[PDB]
PDB file of N, CA and C in Angstrom:
ATOM      1  N   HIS N   1      30.892 -24.294 -37.443  1.00 31.88           N
ATOM      2  CA  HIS N   1      31.462 -25.366 -38.249  1.00 31.88           C
ATOM      3  C   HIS N   1      32.703 -24.835 -38.944  1.00 31.88           C
ATOM      4  N   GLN N   2      33.780 -25.346 -38.621  1.00 31.87           N
ATOM      5  CA  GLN N   2      34.916 -24.675 -39.214  1.00 31.87           C
ATOM      6  C   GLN N   2      35.231 -25.255 -40.584  1.00 31.87           C
ATOM      7  N   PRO N   3      35.744 -24.424 -41.479  1.00 32.70           N
ATOM      8  CA  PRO N   3      36.098 -24.903 -42.806  1.00 32.70           C
ATOM      9  C   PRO N   3      37.540 -25.357 -42.845  1.00 32.70           C
ATOM     10  N   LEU N   4      37.993 -25.867 -43.985  1.00 35.76           N
ATOM     11  CA  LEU N   4      39.347 -26.382 -44.073  1.00 35.76           C
ATOM     12  C   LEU N   4      39.834 -26.256 -45.504  1.00 35.76           C
ATOM     13  N   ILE N   5      41.155 -26.245 -45.652  1.00 34.12           N
ATOM     14  CA  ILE N   5      41.824 -26.070 -46.933  1.00 34.12           C
ATOM     15  C   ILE N   5      42.463 -27.390 -47.323  1.00 34.12           C
ATOM     16  N   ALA N   6      42.094 -27.901 -48.492  1.00 32.79           N
ATOM     17  CA  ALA N   6      42.695 -29.127 -48.995  1.00 32.79           C
ATOM     18  C   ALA N   6      44.140 -28.865 -49.349  1.00 32.79           C
ATOM     19  N   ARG N   7      45.028 -29.678 -48.827  1.00 31.56           N
ATOM     20  CA  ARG N   7      46.426 -29.316 -48.854  1.00 31.56           C
ATOM     21  C   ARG N   7      47.249 -30.454 -49.431  1.00 31.56           C
ATOM     22  N   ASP N   8      48.254 -30.096 -50.211  1.00 33.24           N
ATOM     23  CA  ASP N   8      49.049 -31.044 -50.973  1.00 33.24           C
ATOM     24  C   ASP N   8      50.368 -31.291 -50.274  1.00 33.24           C
ATOM     25  N   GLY N   9      50.677 -32.549 -50.009  1.00 32.94           N
ATOM     26  CA  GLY N   9      52.013 -32.876 -49.597  1.00 32.94           C
ATOM     27  C   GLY N   9      52.042 -33.970 -48.562  1.00 32.94           C
ATOM     28  N   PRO N  10      53.154 -34.078 -47.869  1.00 32.68           N
ATOM     29  CA  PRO N  10      53.201 -34.827 -46.610  1.00 32.68           C
ATOM     30  C   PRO N  10      52.688 -33.999 -45.439  1.00 32.68           C
ATOM     31  N   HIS N  11      51.593 -33.400 -45.621  1.00 32.76           N
ATOM     32  CA  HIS N  11      50.786 -32.780 -44.586  1.00 32.76           C
ATOM     33  C   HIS N  11      49.730 -33.764 -44.105  1.00 32.76           C
ATOM     34  N   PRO N  12      49.440 -33.803 -42.810  1.00 34.85           N
ATOM     35  CA  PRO N  12      48.345 -34.654 -42.343  1.00 34.85           C
ATOM     36  C   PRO N  12      47.028 -34.218 -42.959  1.00 34.85           C
ATOM     37  N   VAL N  13      46.222 -35.207 -43.345  1.00 36.67           N
ATOM     38  CA  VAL N  13      44.983 -34.940 -44.063  1.00 36.67           C
ATOM     39  C   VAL N  13      43.971 -34.303 -43.122  1.00 36.67           C
ATOM     40  N   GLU N  14      43.391 -33.185 -43.546  1.00 31.73           N
ATOM     41  CA  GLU N  14      42.561 -32.368 -42.671  1.00 31.73           C
ATOM     42  C   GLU N  14      41.107 -32.813 -42.708  1.00 31.73           C
ATOM     43  N   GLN N  15      40.514 -32.893 -41.525  1.00 30.56           N
ATOM     44  CA  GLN N  15      39.208 -33.414 -41.190  1.00 30.56           C
ATOM     45  C   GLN N  15      38.299 -32.285 -40.714  1.00 30.56           C
ATOM     46  N   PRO N  16      37.106 -32.101 -41.291  1.00 31.08           N
ATOM     47  CA  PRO N  16      36.213 -31.041 -40.810  1.00 31.08           C
ATOM     48  C   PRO N  16      35.932 -31.153 -39.329  1.00 31.08           C
ATOM     49  N   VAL N  17      35.960 -30.008 -38.642  1.00 32.79           N
ATOM     50  CA  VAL N  17      35.666 -29.945 -37.212  1.00 32.79           C
ATOM     51  C   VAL N  17      34.405 -29.127 -37.006  1.00 32.79           C
ATOM     52  N   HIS N  18      33.680 -29.461 -35.947  1.00 33.63           N
ATOM     53  CA  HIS N  18      32.412 -28.826 -35.622  1.00 33.63           C
ATOM     54  C   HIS N  18      32.421 -28.496 -34.143  1.00 33.63           C
ATOM     55  N   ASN N  19      32.092 -27.261 -33.805  1.00 37.70           N
ATOM     56  CA  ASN N  19      32.196 -26.770 -32.438  1.00 37.70           C
ATOM     57  C   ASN N  19      30.802 -26.556 -31.875  1.00 37.70           C
ATOM     58  N   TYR N  20      30.420 -27.391 -30.921  1.00 36.15           N
ATOM     59  CA  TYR N  20      29.118 -27.337 -30.281  1.00 36.15           C
ATOM     60  C   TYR N  20      29.297 -26.825 -28.862  1.00 36.15           C
ATOM     61  N   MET N  21      28.488 -25.852 -28.470  1.00 38.12           N
ATOM     62  CA  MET N  21      28.681 -25.203 -27.182  1.00 38.12           C
ATOM     63  C   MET N  21      27.352 -24.633 -26.717  1.00 38.12           C
ATOM     64  N   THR N  22      27.304 -24.235 -25.448  1.00 39.47           N
ATOM     65  CA  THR N  22      26.151 -23.562 -24.868  1.00 39.47           C
ATOM     66  C   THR N  22      26.629 -22.582 -23.815  1.00 39.47           C
ATOM     67  N   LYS N  23      25.942 -21.456 -23.698  1.00 39.78           N
ATOM     68  CA  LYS N  23      26.176 -20.501 -22.629  1.00 39.78           C
ATOM     69  C   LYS N  23      25.039 -20.567 -21.619  1.00 39.78           C
ATOM     70  N   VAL N  24      25.088 -19.687 -20.634  1.00 42.29           N
ATOM     71  CA  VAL N  24      23.973 -19.483 -19.726  1.00 42.29           C
ATOM     72  C   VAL N  24      23.790 -17.988 -19.553  1.00 42.29           C
ATOM     73  N   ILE N  25      22.553 -17.575 -19.310  1.00 46.80           N
ATOM     74  CA  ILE N  25      22.289 -16.157 -19.159  1.00 46.80           C
ATOM     75  C   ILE N  25      22.683 -15.756 -17.746  1.00 46.80           C
ATOM     76  N   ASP N  26      22.643 -14.469 -17.448  1.00 47.51           N
ATOM     77  CA  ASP N  26      22.952 -13.953 -16.125  1.00 47.51           C
ATOM     78  C   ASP N  26      21.678 -13.359 -15.546  1.00 47.51           C
ATOM     79  N   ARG N  27      21.732 -12.883 -14.310  1.00 48.08           N
ATOM     80  CA  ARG N  27      20.471 -12.479 -13.713  1.00 48.08           C
ATOM     81  C   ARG N  27      20.455 -11.037 -13.236  1.00 48.08           C
ATOM     82  N   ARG N  28      21.055 -10.761 -12.089  1.00 47.65           N
ATOM     83  CA  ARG N  28      21.224  -9.389 -11.635  1.00 47.65           C
ATOM     84  C   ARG N  28      19.889  -8.637 -11.626  1.00 47.65           C
ATOM     85  N   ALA N  29      19.022  -9.042 -10.704  1.00 43.16           N
ATOM     86  CA  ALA N  29      17.782  -8.311 -10.493  1.00 43.16           C
ATOM     87  C   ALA N  29      18.101  -6.900 -10.034  1.00 43.16           C
ATOM     88  N   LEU N  30      17.353  -5.960 -10.604  1.00 46.33           N
ATOM     89  CA  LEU N  30      17.553  -4.524 -10.445  1.00 46.33           C
ATOM     90  C   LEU N  30      16.525  -3.968  -9.508  1.00 46.33           C
ATOM     91  N   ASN N  31      16.951  -3.130  -8.586  1.00 47.10           N
ATOM     92  CA  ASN N  31      16.020  -2.614  -7.591  1.00 47.10           C
ATOM     93  C   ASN N  31      15.969  -1.095  -7.599  1.00 47.10           C
ATOM     94  N   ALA N  32      14.761  -0.548  -7.564  1.00 44.38           N
ATOM     95  CA  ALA N  32      14.519   0.845  -7.229  1.00 44.38           C
ATOM     96  C   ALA N  32      13.571   0.878  -6.043  1.00 44.38           C
ATOM     97  N   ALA N  33      13.521   2.004  -5.347  1.00 42.97           N
ATOM     98  CA  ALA N  33      12.729   2.094  -4.128  1.00 42.97           C
ATOM     99  C   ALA N  33      11.638   3.145  -4.249  1.00 42.97           C
ATOM    100  N   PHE N  34      10.942   3.342  -3.137  1.00 42.57           N
ATOM    101  CA  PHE N  34       9.962   4.402  -2.978  1.00 42.57           C
ATOM    102  C   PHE N  34       9.765   4.602  -1.485  1.00 42.57           C
ATOM    103  N   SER N  35       9.142   5.713  -1.103  1.00 40.75           N
ATOM    104  CA  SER N  35       8.622   5.823   0.254  1.00 40.75           C
ATOM    105  C   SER N  35       7.345   6.649   0.268  1.00 40.75           C
ATOM    106  N   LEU N  36       6.333   6.170   0.993  1.00 41.49           N
ATOM    107  CA  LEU N  36       5.176   6.987   1.335  1.00 41.49           C
ATOM    108  C   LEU N  36       4.816   6.684   2.777  1.00 41.49           C
ATOM    109  N   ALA N  37       4.529   7.723   3.527  1.00 45.24           N
ATOM    110  CA  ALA N  37       4.279   7.442   4.893  1.00 45.24           C
ATOM    111  C   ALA N  37       3.162   8.115   5.610  1.00 45.24           C
ATOM    112  N   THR N  38       2.450   7.262   6.312  1.00 45.60           N
ATOM    113  CA  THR N  38       1.440   7.650   7.293  1.00 45.60           C
ATOM    114  C   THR N  38       0.459   8.587   6.601  1.00 45.60           C
ATOM    115  N   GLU N  39       0.260   9.767   7.193  1.00 48.12           N
ATOM    116  CA  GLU N  39      -0.742  10.714   6.717  1.00 48.12           C
ATOM    117  C   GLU N  39      -1.101  10.592   5.243  1.00 48.12           C
ATOM    118  N   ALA N  40      -0.099  10.619   4.366  1.00 45.46           N
ATOM    119  CA  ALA N  40      -0.387  10.497   2.947  1.00 45.46           C
ATOM    120  C   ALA N  40      -0.662   9.063   2.526  1.00 45.46           C
ATOM    121  N   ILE N  41      -0.385   8.079   3.385  1.00 44.75           N
ATOM    122  CA  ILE N  41      -0.799   6.715   3.081  1.00 44.75           C
ATOM    123  C   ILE N  41      -2.309   6.586   3.187  1.00 44.75           C
ATOM    124  N   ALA N  42      -2.876   7.038   4.298  1.00 49.03           N
ATOM    125  CA  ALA N  42      -4.311   6.934   4.494  1.00 49.03           C
ATOM    126  C   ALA N  42      -5.075   8.099   3.885  1.00 49.03           C
ATOM    127  N   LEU N  43      -4.387   9.177   3.498  1.00 47.93           N
ATOM    128  CA  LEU N  43      -5.029  10.184   2.663  1.00 47.93           C
ATOM    129  C   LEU N  43      -5.510   9.557   1.366  1.00 47.93           C
ATOM    130  N   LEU N  44      -4.712   8.665   0.798  1.00 47.61           N
ATOM    131  CA  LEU N  44      -5.063   7.964  -0.427  1.00 47.61           C
ATOM    132  C   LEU N  44      -5.577   6.593  -0.024  1.00 47.61           C
ATOM    133  N   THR N  45      -6.818   6.413  -0.448  1.00 46.89           N
ATOM    134  CA  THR N  45      -7.684   5.273  -0.198  1.00 46.89           C
ATOM    135  C   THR N  45      -8.895   5.811   0.577  1.00 46.89           C
ATOM    136  N   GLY N  46      -9.968   5.041   0.660  1.00 46.09           N
ATOM    137  CA  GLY N  46     -11.110   5.534   1.401  1.00 46.09           C
ATOM    138  C   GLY N  46     -10.632   5.602   2.831  1.00 46.09           C
ATOM    139  N   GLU N  47     -10.914   6.734   3.493  1.00 45.66           N
ATOM    140  CA  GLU N  47     -10.515   7.149   4.858  1.00 45.66           C
ATOM    141  C   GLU N  47     -10.604   8.663   4.947  1.00 45.66           C
ATOM    142  N   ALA N  48     -10.724   9.339   3.818  1.00 49.57           N
ATOM    143  CA  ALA N  48     -10.825  10.787   3.820  1.00 49.57           C
ATOM    144  C   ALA N  48     -12.148  11.221   3.214  1.00 49.57           C
ATOM    145  N   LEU N  49     -13.080  10.282   3.108  1.00 49.23           N
ATOM    146  CA  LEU N  49     -14.341  10.568   2.445  1.00 49.23           C
ATOM    147  C   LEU N  49     -15.619  10.725   3.297  1.00 49.23           C
TER     148      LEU N  49
ATOM    149  N   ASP Y   1     -40.572 -23.468  31.576  1.00 50.58           N
ATOM    150  CA  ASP Y   1     -42.018 -23.569  31.794  1.00 50.58           C
ATOM    151  C   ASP Y   1     -42.516 -22.410  32.664  1.00 50.58           C
ATOM    152  N   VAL Y   2     -42.520 -21.232  32.035  1.00 50.26           N
ATOM    153  CA  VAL Y   2     -42.869 -19.967  32.672  1.00 50.26           C
ATOM    154  C   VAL Y   2     -43.680 -19.159  31.660  1.00 50.26           C
ATOM    155  N   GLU Y   3     -44.011 -17.907  31.978  1.00 53.95           N
ATOM    156  CA  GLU Y   3     -44.754 -17.049  31.060  1.00 53.95           C
ATOM    157  C   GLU Y   3     -44.320 -15.605  31.260  1.00 53.95           C
ATOM    158  N   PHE Y   4     -44.211 -14.851  30.165  1.00 53.80           N
ATOM    159  CA  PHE Y   4     -43.779 -13.457  30.226  1.00 53.80           C
ATOM    160  C   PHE Y   4     -44.836 -12.538  29.638  1.00 53.80           C
ATOM    161  N   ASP Y   5     -45.516 -11.798  30.498  1.00 54.62           N
ATOM    162  CA  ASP Y   5     -46.271 -10.620  30.107  1.00 54.62           C
ATOM    163  C   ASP Y   5     -45.343  -9.415  30.050  1.00 54.62           C
ATOM    164  N   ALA Y   6     -45.717  -8.430  29.245  1.00 53.91           N
ATOM    165  CA  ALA Y   6     -44.938  -7.208  29.112  1.00 53.91           C
ATOM    166  C   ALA Y   6     -45.800  -6.013  29.468  1.00 53.91           C
ATOM    167  N   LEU Y   7     -45.285  -5.130  30.319  1.00 54.95           N
ATOM    168  CA  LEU Y   7     -46.042  -3.944  30.697  1.00 54.95           C
ATOM    169  C   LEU Y   7     -46.227  -3.026  29.506  1.00 54.95           C
ATOM    170  N   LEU Y   8     -47.465  -2.596  29.291  1.00 57.45           N
ATOM    171  CA  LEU Y   8     -47.749  -1.687  28.193  1.00 57.45           C
ATOM    172  C   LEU Y   8     -47.345  -0.266  28.560  1.00 57.45           C
ATOM    173  N   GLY Y   9     -47.972   0.310  29.577  1.00 56.65           N
ATOM    174  CA  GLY Y   9     -47.481   1.559  30.119  1.00 56.65           C
ATOM    175  C   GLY Y   9     -46.146   1.384  30.817  1.00 56.65           C
ATOM    176  N   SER Y  10     -45.491   2.509  31.097  1.00 57.13           N
ATOM    177  CA  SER Y  10     -44.246   2.518  31.865  1.00 57.13           C
ATOM    178  C   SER Y  10     -43.122   1.709  31.228  1.00 57.13           C
ATOM    179  N   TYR Y  11     -42.509   2.231  30.170  1.00 55.48           N
ATOM    180  CA  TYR Y  11     -41.345   1.613  29.555  1.00 55.48           C
ATOM    181  C   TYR Y  11     -40.079   1.858  30.379  1.00 55.48           C
ATOM    182  N   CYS Y  12     -39.057   1.037  30.123  1.00 55.37           N
ATOM    183  CA  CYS Y  12     -37.951   0.880  31.065  1.00 55.37           C
ATOM    184  C   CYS Y  12     -36.920   1.997  31.015  1.00 55.37           C
ATOM    185  N   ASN Y  13     -36.605   2.533  29.838  1.00 59.02           N
ATOM    186  CA  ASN Y  13     -35.594   3.585  29.700  1.00 59.02           C
ATOM    187  C   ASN Y  13     -34.219   3.103  30.171  1.00 59.02           C
ATOM    188  N   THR Y  14     -33.627   2.238  29.358  1.00 58.41           N
ATOM    189  CA  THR Y  14     -32.233   1.859  29.514  1.00 58.41           C
ATOM    190  C   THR Y  14     -31.367   2.802  28.693  1.00 58.41           C
ATOM    191  N   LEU Y  15     -30.318   3.336  29.308  1.00 54.78           N
ATOM    192  CA  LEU Y  15     -29.367   4.188  28.605  1.00 54.78           C
ATOM    193  C   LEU Y  15     -30.032   5.399  27.971  1.00 54.78           C
ATOM    194  N   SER Y  16     -30.397   6.385  28.776  1.00 56.05           N
ATOM    195  CA  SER Y  16     -30.707   7.691  28.223  1.00 56.05           C
ATOM    196  C   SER Y  16     -29.466   8.261  27.556  1.00 56.05           C
ATOM    197  N   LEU Y  17     -29.630   8.786  26.353  1.00 56.34           N
ATOM    198  CA  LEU Y  17     -28.523   9.349  25.597  1.00 56.34           C
ATOM    199  C   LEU Y  17     -28.537  10.861  25.733  1.00 56.34           C
ATOM    200  N   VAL Y  18     -27.468  11.411  26.286  1.00 55.65           N
ATOM    201  CA  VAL Y  18     -27.284  12.850  26.348  1.00 55.65           C
ATOM    202  C   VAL Y  18     -26.567  13.297  25.091  1.00 55.65           C
ATOM    203  N   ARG Y  19     -27.091  14.337  24.458  1.00 56.71           N
ATOM    204  CA  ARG Y  19     -26.426  15.003  23.357  1.00 56.71           C
ATOM    205  C   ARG Y  19     -25.686  16.201  23.917  1.00 56.71           C
ATOM    206  N   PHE Y  20     -24.508  16.483  23.365  1.00 54.66           N
ATOM    207  CA  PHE Y  20     -23.684  17.518  23.965  1.00 54.66           C
ATOM    208  C   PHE Y  20     -24.292  18.894  23.780  1.00 54.66           C
ATOM    209  N   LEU Y  21     -24.902  19.150  22.639  1.00 57.36           N
ATOM    210  CA  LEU Y  21     -25.812  20.271  22.551  1.00 57.36           C
ATOM    211  C   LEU Y  21     -27.079  19.903  23.296  1.00 57.36           C
ATOM    212  N   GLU Y  22     -27.814  20.917  23.723  1.00 58.60           N
ATOM    213  CA  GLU Y  22     -28.948  20.817  24.632  1.00 58.60           C
ATOM    214  C   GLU Y  22     -28.450  20.771  26.067  1.00 58.60           C
ATOM    215  N   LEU Y  23     -27.144  20.798  26.301  1.00 61.96           N
ATOM    216  CA  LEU Y  23     -26.682  20.962  27.665  1.00 61.96           C
ATOM    217  C   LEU Y  23     -26.810  22.416  28.094  1.00 61.96           C
ATOM    218  N   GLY Y  24     -26.540  22.655  29.370  1.00 59.44           N
ATOM    219  CA  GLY Y  24     -26.339  24.009  29.826  1.00 59.44           C
ATOM    220  C   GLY Y  24     -24.955  24.410  29.390  1.00 59.44           C
ATOM    221  N   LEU Y  25     -23.999  23.508  29.453  1.00 58.44           N
ATOM    222  CA  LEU Y  25     -22.577  23.799  29.182  1.00 58.44           C
ATOM    223  C   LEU Y  25     -22.013  24.084  27.809  1.00 58.44           C
ATOM    224  N   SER Y  26     -22.781  23.957  26.751  1.00 56.14           N
ATOM    225  CA  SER Y  26     -22.221  24.185  25.432  1.00 56.14           C
ATOM    226  C   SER Y  26     -22.223  25.601  24.942  1.00 56.14           C
ATOM    227  N   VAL Y  27     -22.677  26.554  25.742  1.00 53.84           N
ATOM    228  CA  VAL Y  27     -22.670  27.938  25.297  1.00 53.84           C
ATOM    229  C   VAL Y  27     -21.274  28.321  25.064  1.00 53.84           C
ATOM    230  N   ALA Y  28     -20.410  27.863  25.949  1.00 51.86           N
ATOM    231  CA  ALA Y  28     -19.001  28.168  26.002  1.00 51.86           C
ATOM    232  C   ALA Y  28     -18.131  27.738  24.836  1.00 51.86           C
ATOM    233  N   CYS Y  29     -18.656  27.035  23.860  1.00 52.85           N
ATOM    234  CA  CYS Y  29     -17.779  26.651  22.822  1.00 52.85           C
ATOM    235  C   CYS Y  29     -18.546  26.628  21.591  1.00 52.85           C
ATOM    236  N   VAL Y  30     -17.872  26.855  20.487  1.00 53.07           N
ATOM    237  CA  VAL Y  30     -18.515  26.746  19.208  1.00 53.07           C
ATOM    238  C   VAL Y  30     -17.793  25.576  18.572  1.00 53.07           C
ATOM    239  N   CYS Y  31     -18.526  24.619  18.028  1.00 53.92           N
ATOM    240  CA  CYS Y  31     -17.892  23.438  17.473  1.00 53.92           C
ATOM    241  C   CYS Y  31     -17.935  23.301  15.974  1.00 53.92           C
ATOM    242  N   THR Y  32     -16.796  22.973  15.389  1.00 52.01           N
ATOM    243  CA  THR Y  32     -16.670  22.802  13.966  1.00 52.01           C
ATOM    244  C   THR Y  32     -15.879  21.547  13.826  1.00 52.01           C
ATOM    245  N   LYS Y  33     -15.942  20.905  12.670  1.00 54.11           N
ATOM    246  CA  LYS Y  33     -15.245  19.636  12.444  1.00 54.11           C
ATOM    247  C   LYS Y  33     -13.950  19.804  11.664  1.00 54.11           C
ATOM    248  N   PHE Y  34     -12.751  19.405  12.116  1.00 50.50           N
ATOM    249  CA  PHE Y  34     -11.762  19.715  11.101  1.00 50.50           C
ATOM    250  C   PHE Y  34     -11.223  18.376  10.626  1.00 50.50           C
ATOM    251  N   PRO Y  35     -12.029  17.676   9.847  1.00 53.10           N
ATOM    252  CA  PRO Y  35     -11.727  16.288   9.563  1.00 53.10           C
ATOM    253  C   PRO Y  35     -10.539  16.117   8.699  1.00 53.10           C
ATOM    254  N   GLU Y  36      -9.490  16.789   9.133  1.00 55.42           N
ATOM    255  CA  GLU Y  36      -8.203  16.720   8.514  1.00 55.42           C
ATOM    256  C   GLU Y  36      -7.229  16.964   9.635  1.00 55.42           C
ATOM    257  N   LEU Y  37      -7.725  16.985  10.861  1.00 56.81           N
ATOM    258  CA  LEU Y  37      -6.868  17.245  12.007  1.00 56.81           C
ATOM    259  C   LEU Y  37      -6.213  15.992  12.548  1.00 56.81           C
ATOM    260  N   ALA Y  38      -6.629  14.872  12.003  1.00 55.32           N
ATOM    261  CA  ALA Y  38      -5.968  13.642  12.308  1.00 55.32           C
ATOM    262  C   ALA Y  38      -4.587  13.812  11.676  1.00 55.32           C
ATOM    263  N   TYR Y  39      -4.560  14.354  10.460  1.00 54.44           N
ATOM    264  CA  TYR Y  39      -3.349  14.580   9.686  1.00 54.44           C
ATOM    265  C   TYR Y  39      -2.895  16.015   9.715  1.00 54.44           C
ATOM    266  N   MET Y  40      -3.452  16.784  10.626  1.00 53.18           N
ATOM    267  CA  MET Y  40      -3.134  18.192  10.719  1.00 53.18           C
ATOM    268  C   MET Y  40      -1.709  18.555  11.081  1.00 53.18           C
ATOM    269  N   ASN Y  41      -1.091  17.806  11.986  1.00 56.00           N
ATOM    270  CA  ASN Y  41       0.286  18.076  12.363  1.00 56.00           C
ATOM    271  C   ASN Y  41       0.535  19.507  12.835  1.00 56.00           C
ATOM    272  N   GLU Y  42      -0.319  19.972  13.744  1.00 56.48           N
ATOM    273  CA  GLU Y  42      -0.298  21.316  14.349  1.00 56.48           C
ATOM    274  C   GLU Y  42      -1.336  22.227  13.706  1.00 56.48           C
ATOM    275  N   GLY Y  43      -2.068  22.951  14.548  1.00 58.36           N
ATOM    276  CA  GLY Y  43      -3.120  23.842  14.104  1.00 58.36           C
ATOM    277  C   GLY Y  43      -3.215  25.036  15.011  1.00 58.36           C
ATOM    278  N   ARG Y  44      -3.763  26.132  14.508  1.00 56.18           N
ATOM    279  CA  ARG Y  44      -3.881  27.316  15.261  1.00 56.18           C
ATOM    280  C   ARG Y  44      -5.151  27.948  14.806  1.00 56.18           C
ATOM    281  N   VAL Y  45      -5.880  28.529  15.724  1.00 55.64           N
ATOM    282  CA  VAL Y  45      -7.059  29.210  15.311  1.00 55.64           C
ATOM    283  C   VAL Y  45      -6.636  30.622  15.420  1.00 55.64           C
ATOM    284  N   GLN Y  46      -6.711  31.372  14.343  1.00 54.23           N
ATOM    285  CA  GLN Y  46      -6.360  32.756  14.479  1.00 54.23           C
ATOM    286  C   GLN Y  46      -7.507  33.646  14.164  1.00 54.23           C
ATOM    287  N   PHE Y  47      -7.944  34.335  15.191  1.00 50.47           N
ATOM    288  CA  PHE Y  47      -9.007  35.296  15.173  1.00 50.47           C
ATOM    289  C   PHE Y  47      -8.302  36.573  15.529  1.00 50.47           C
ATOM    290  N   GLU Y  48      -8.630  37.632  14.854  1.00 48.14           N
ATOM    291  CA  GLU Y  48      -7.931  38.890  15.092  1.00 48.14           C
ATOM    292  C   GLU Y  48      -8.917  39.986  15.451  1.00 48.14           C
ATOM    293  N   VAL Y  49      -8.651  40.705  16.543  1.00 47.45           N
ATOM    294  CA  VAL Y  49      -9.570  41.710  17.058  1.00 47.45           C
ATOM    295  C   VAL Y  49      -8.906  43.078  17.041  1.00 47.45           C
TER     296      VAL Y  49
END
């Protein structure tokens, strides 16, 4: 809401102004990886018991 | 519309099961389990004389 200064003279009379707006968020999903393969895949889980 | 008697003596013997021990042929090998040889990725038996 912007303010204003009351001003004397042949100046145009000042009217309060109000600024209404909206943004939007961004996304940018972040990725990390992994790898496990074969032998150590079935080493972990029942299969070695 | 028939009838089935079953012989008491003289059973049929379907699928005799041979065990690998009790053969004549197993003298030649000594067997051990290396239940990690699925994932062994190369093995060597080293006996030193």
